[PDB]
Amino acid sequence: VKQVFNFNAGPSALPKPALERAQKELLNFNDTQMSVMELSHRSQSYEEVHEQAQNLLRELLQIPNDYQILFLQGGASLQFTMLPMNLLTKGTIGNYVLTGSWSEKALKEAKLLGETHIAASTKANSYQSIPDFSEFQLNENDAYLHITSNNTIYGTQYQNFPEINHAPLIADMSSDILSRPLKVNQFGMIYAGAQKNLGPSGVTVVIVKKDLLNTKVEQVPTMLQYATHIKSDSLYNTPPTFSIYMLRNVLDWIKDLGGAEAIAKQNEEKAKIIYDTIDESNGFYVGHAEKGSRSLMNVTFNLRNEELNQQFLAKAKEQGFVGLNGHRSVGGCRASIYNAVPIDACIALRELMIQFKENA
Amino acid sequence: KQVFNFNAGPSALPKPALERAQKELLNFNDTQMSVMELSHRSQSYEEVHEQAQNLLRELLQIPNDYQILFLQGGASLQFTMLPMNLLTKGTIGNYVLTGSWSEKALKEAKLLGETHIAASTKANSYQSIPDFSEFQLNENDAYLHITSNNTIYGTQYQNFPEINHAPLIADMSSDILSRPLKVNQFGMIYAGAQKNLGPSGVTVVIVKKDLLVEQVPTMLQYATHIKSDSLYNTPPTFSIYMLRNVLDWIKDLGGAEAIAKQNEEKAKIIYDTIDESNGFYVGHAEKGSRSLMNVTFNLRNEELNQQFLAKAKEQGFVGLNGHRSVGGCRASIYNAVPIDACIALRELMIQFKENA
Numbered sequence: 168v169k170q171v172f173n174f175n176a177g178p179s180a181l182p183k184p185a186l187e188r189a190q191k192e193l194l195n196f197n198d199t200q201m202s203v204m205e206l207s208h209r210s211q212s213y214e215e216v217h218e219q220a221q222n223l224l225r226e227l228l229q230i231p232n233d234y235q236i237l238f239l240q241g242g243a244s245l246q247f248t249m250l251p252m253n254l255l256t257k258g259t260i261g262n263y264v265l266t267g268s269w270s271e272k273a274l275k276e277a278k279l280l281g282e283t284h285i286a287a288s289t290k291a292n293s294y295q296s297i298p299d300f301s302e303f304q305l306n307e308n309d310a311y312l313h314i315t316s317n318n319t320i321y322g323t324q325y326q327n328f329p330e331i332n333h334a335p336l337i338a339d340m341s342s343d344i345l346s347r348p349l350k351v352n353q354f355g356m357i358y359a360g361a362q363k364n365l366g367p368s369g370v371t372v373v374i375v376k377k378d379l380l381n382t383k384v385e386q387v388p389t390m391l392q393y394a395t396h397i398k399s400d401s402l403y404n405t406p407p408t409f410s411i412y413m414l415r416n417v418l419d420w421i422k423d424l425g426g427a428e429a430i431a432k433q434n435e436e437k438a439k440i441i442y443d444t445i446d447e448s449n450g451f452y453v454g455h456a457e458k459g460s461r462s463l464m465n466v467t468f469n470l471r472n473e474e475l476n477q478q479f480l481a482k483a484k485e486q487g488f489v490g491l492n493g494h495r496s497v498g499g500c501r502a503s504i505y506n507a508v509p510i511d512a513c514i515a516l517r518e519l520m521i522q523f524k525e526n527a
Numbered sequence: 528k529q530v531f532n533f534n535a536g537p538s539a540l541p542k543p544a545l546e547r548a549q550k551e552l553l554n555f556n557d558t559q560m561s562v563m564e565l566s567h568r569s570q571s572y573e574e575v576h577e578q579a580q581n582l583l584r585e586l587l588q589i590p591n592d593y594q595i596l597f598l599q600g601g602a603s604l605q606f607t608m609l610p611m612n613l614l615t616k617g618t619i620g621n622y623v624l625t626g627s628w629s630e631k632a633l634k635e636a637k638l639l640g641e642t643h644i645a646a647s648t649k650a651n652s653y654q655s656i657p658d659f660s661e662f663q664l665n666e667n668d669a670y671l672h673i674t675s676n677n678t679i680y681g682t683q684y685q686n687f688p689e690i691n692h693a694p695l696i697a698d699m700s701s702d703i704l705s706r707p708l709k710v711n712q713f714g715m716i717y718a719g720a721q722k723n724l725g726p727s728g729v730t731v732v733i734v735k736k737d738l739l740v741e742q743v744p745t746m747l748q749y750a751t752h753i754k755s756d757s758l759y760n761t762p763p764t765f766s767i768y769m770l771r772n773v774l775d776w777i778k779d780l781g782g783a784e785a786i787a788k789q790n791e792e793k794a795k796i797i798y799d800t801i802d803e804s805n806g807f808y809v810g811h812a813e814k815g816s817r818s819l820m821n822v823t824f825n826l827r828n829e830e831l832n833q834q835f836l837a838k839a840k841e842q843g844f845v846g847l848n849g850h851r852s853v854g855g856c857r858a859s860i861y862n863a864v865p866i867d868a869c870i871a872l873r874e875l876m877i878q879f880k881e882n883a
């Protein structure tokens with residue numbers, strides 16, 4: 168049929184082979200004559216999947232042995248409250264670096280539970296950049312320092328991560344996890360809803376330093392303790408088995424293309440196609456982010472006025488582009504170009520953008 | 528290549544629902560994307576989301592003053608979310624204990640407030656549902672919590688108590704939409720989908736709206752999800768899609784009364800086999816409390832138990848081992864387990880008895 172270009176921001180494009188693989192074995196997985204969705208999570212066929220998803224992640228990001236990988240339900244949003252529930256103890260402070268709307272949502276949940284602080288913020292200038300690490304206001308009684316690696320709605324991204332030694336560094340990496348190599352030991356915990364760059368909705372990957380959080384926290388509901396899930400290897404209650412399976416399949420694909428290092432090269436190339444288009448447009452398109460902070464995962468821009476914005480987005484949708492409307496809170500446009508978005512989609516978008524401009 | 532899926536959770540699903548999923552896995556609704564690749568704020572997803580709710584409303588005849596929520600975290604998260612929202616100071620979370628799942632729910636409430644046991648058949652190892660006239664209720668109960676089907680013990684409420692002093696709340700994980708329900712008896716009903724309704728990953732919560740909050744985390748307030756139609760954060764979109772598909776299958780076969788007929792025949796096959804076995808197979812539940820969803824039983828000794836389950840596995844039966852906490856055998860016969868599987872089980876039970 169006609170072309171479809173999938174720039175959805177979350178859930179988002181999956182790599183075709185992961186979907187083709189799932190489709191082919193949907194009714195009979197691993198010769199059991201059952202769908203993976205119909206298996207016990209205590210079955211050896213399921214446990215193989217669960218363990219393989221962990222081992223692929225471990226290998227791909229080179230996660231150290233003193234870290235454990237959790238597969239949790241509830242989305243990143245549930246992590247916004249689970250994190251302060253476990254680590255934000257009395258007399259301590261949940262310190263946040265604000266670099267977008269998702270950082271504010273994280274902060275708000277800690278505020279419900281303890282003392283919070285704002286280490287640095289670019290909110291005044293509408294989150295066009297990542298603040299300088301030298302501006303970080305740190306406290307001796309900080310329970311952690313929390314950052315948002317990729318600011319999905321604003322199109323900005325950490326180029327690198329601060330060295331923090333007084334508290335654990337925590338990061339919401341929902342929209343750029345495993346888009347590039349990572350030095351995992353810079354962090355006490357990393358979390359990501361899978362649906363942006365790792366596969367389906369319904370599971371949240373939580374990489375945690377075991378000794379920071381393998382201990383019972385008095386007064387915390389069993390399901391909301393990290394310890395629960397660490398001890399039970401994310402099998403305390405019934406896991407999202409199909410989501411974890413699809414995550415496995417996506418991880419296999421990342422490994423098959425050369426891992427984090429190769430996918431970064433691909434992601435830089437796709438991003439470049441779009442940013443060069445913006446940058447050669449003589450102001451017809453204006454990127455929200457400052458150049459040093461441009462995200463490789465979510466490209467945010469506006470045309471010169473809202474009428475042109477709307478005509479551009481209507482034309483895109485007529486031409487088969489999906490998901491380009493900016494987040495409802497900020498308007499404009501947003502090209503999400505996560506790992507699995509193909510480069511010819513990016514070329515197509517550039518073509519769209521150039522003819523729209525020339526014809527305007 | 529014969530396989531009979533008696534898994535207790537996650538579990539068998541309807542072949543037509545899985546075949547339909549397979550067929551359109553790469554191209555949902557002519558969008559040329561998987562349902563898994565759609566934005567949850569897309570109309571495409573939003574229609575599926577709503578269709579899943581609509582089918583439950585139709586099939587259970589859920590009144591307008593109830594809302595239907597799709598949450599993550601399993602029935603287990605509901606164990607704490609419920610008291611978190613309703614167990615206010617000076618009130619009591621009152622529990623009816625009819626098995627281990629009851630116990631797990633009560634435990635979470637004890638973290639958050641005053642609790643109470645209205646009744647319990649624990650002393651007798653949960654062989655039955657207590658008589659409602661036995662319940663000990665309190666003026667200040669925040670709710671009365673029950674477990675409609677005691678998955679590990681094989682017992683099930685035949686009917687529900689008429690409770691007017693406080694909302695009746697039910698963990699229906701292992702029997703929701705296996706028979707018609709009078710939803711007006713309850714203030715809230717909850718169930719992980721992964722037994723009767725869909726794959727794991729989504730929890731269905733049916734809640735009396737006006738029934739349900741300072742200082743509770745946003746994600747743990749029912750009001751958050753009611754207000755946002757379970758679209759506050761990203762829902763488990765594929766699981767809700769599969770839930771829709773399963774609900775379409777239940778509607779297509781004739782709805783809650785029709786599936787009850789199938790379920791009662793399935794259970795009749797196994798219980799008759801047990802009852803006719805002259806004590807070779809012994810059911811755990813008192814007759815009057817026998818579950819239609821999980822049939823629990825043992826052979827005369829542990830070694831026969833083990834010989835049977837080994838023979839079962841060799842013959843393609845999956846999931847019949849009893850819960851580790853109780854041992855024995857458990858045949859889970861949720862909605863999508865076909866009558867032919869139960870017939871096969873019977874024939875195996877009879878042959879095994881003959882050959883012992």
Ligand SMILES: *Cc1c(COP(=O)(O)O)cnc(C)c1O
Pocket residue numbers: 177241242243244245269315317318319339340341342360363760761762
């Ligand atoms: C998508 C997103 C979230 C929300 O994740 P849910 O799974 O919907 O809770 C949180 N943080 C970031 C940075 C995101 O991009």
Ligand SMILES: *Cc1c(COP(=O)(O)O)cnc(C)c1O
Pocket residue numbers: 404405536600601602603604628674676677678698699700701719
């Ligand atoms: C399966 C079951 C549960 C556990 O559900 P999860 O989704 O694993 O939390 C809780 N209660 C009952 C009655 C169940 O049968």
Ligand SMILES: [Cl-]
Pocket residue numbers: 266267268269270317318319320321322
């Ligand atoms: Cl953001």
Ligand SMILES: [Cl-]
Pocket residue numbers: 176177319320494
């Ligand atoms: Cl977003």
Ligand SMILES: [Cl-]
Pocket residue numbers: 625626627628629676677678679680
């Ligand atoms: Cl039970």
Ligand SMILES: [Cl-]
Pocket residue numbers: 535536678679850
């Ligand atoms: Cl169980």
Ligand SMILES: [Mg+2]
Pocket residue numbers: 419422423
């Ligand atoms: Mg490979």
Ligand SMILES: [Mg+2]
Pocket residue numbers: 509511
């Ligand atoms: Mg192509």
Ligand SMILES: [Mg+2]
Pocket residue numbers: 775778779
């Ligand atoms: Mg139909």
Ligand SMILES: [Mg+2]
Pocket residue numbers: 799
């Ligand atoms: Mg008879």
